[PDB]
């Protein structure tokens, strides 16, 4: 059963920290792909839930988090919650 | 074979159908008897 109210499993990632993390990743990718190119992050295009979501196990439970809120940006030359 | 309905909690929550309340006849210690079980399953673990 469920005691109390039903609430969705979720993950909290700091928005500013992730934005800085992606900025660093983009800089390093530009080193290989070109200083003047555009690096776009996007959600996984398809396949089993194991590969379209962030699969992990903590607390003894197996979580599948969307992550579409983390990889949805185009890089040209307070908190984020993942369902 | 499971006979499932939506969990349907008391409060409305835009997550209806994510958890199903499934009735089934499970085995028990003795092979001549079966036990009716009501279990909750996640939507992703069952197919119609």
């Amino acid at each position, epitope marked *: 059963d469920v005691l109390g*109210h*039903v*609430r*969705m499993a*979720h993950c909290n990632i700091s928005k500013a920290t992730w934005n800085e993390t992606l900025g660093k990743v983009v800089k390093q990718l530009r080193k290989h792909f070109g200083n003047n190119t555009i690096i776009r992050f996007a959600q996984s295009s398809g396949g089993d839930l194991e590969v379209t979501t962030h699969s992990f196990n903590c607390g003894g439970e197996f979580f599948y988090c*969307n992550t579409s*809120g983390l990889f949805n940006s185009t890089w040209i030359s307070d908190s984020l*919650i*993942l*369902p | 074979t499971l006979q499932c*309905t*939506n969990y*349907a909690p008391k*409060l*409305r*929550s*835009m*997550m*209806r*159908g994510e958890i199903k309340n499934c009735s089934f006849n499970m085995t028990t210690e003795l092979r001549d008897k079966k036990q009716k079980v009501y279990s909750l399953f996640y939507r992703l673990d069952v197919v119609q």
Partner: antibody
Amino acid sequence: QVQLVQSGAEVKKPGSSVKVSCKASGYTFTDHYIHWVRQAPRQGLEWMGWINPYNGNTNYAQKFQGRVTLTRDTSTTTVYMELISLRSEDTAVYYCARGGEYCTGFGCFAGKGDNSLDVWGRGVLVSVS
Amino acid sequence: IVMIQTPLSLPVTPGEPASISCRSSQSLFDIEDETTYLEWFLQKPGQSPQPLIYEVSNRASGVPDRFSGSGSDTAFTLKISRVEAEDVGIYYCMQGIEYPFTFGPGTKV
């Protein structure tokens, strides 16, 4: 308890822009959609649109696309509707309502959509003349 | 858009039972959710509409037990065991299954 607080009244000339507030209290502001419904005098209820107070995504009835803009303030937990190009046929009481379904106990970051209106405010009468 | 009708807008006296009908041009039953999204409201004079029934038969909290209802396949009925002074106002039936939501003309008590 759960409340939506609206007050006052406004009178506008045709073509004017009016902002109608809806202050939320007693529940998590970001975990229910806020819907706007128009009620013309001596007429029935007409749905205008819905704003997601967490993301700011909105959806409007086809007749209101391009005329109604919804915004939010999550620090003040208030939803505002801005109406432009007011016409005589737009005289009505404008009600805000809280959806009956919660999105998630921690906010509207996921979900298919709402299906009901649980809490209604008193409404704001807007007249055009 | 789905059009909603509300037949039987009739005067009643105190203590009389009542029945208010609602008819939809399109079925309100969501196969995946296994529920019909029809919310009944009562708008008292001078007040905003308040919920009565959230899903055809599921009565809202705080609503007198005199209110009930049933139906399916677009045809729904709201029933009142006994009409009292607090039942005066306009009754509406929502079309929650799809956006935009519609309420129908409504009936008067």
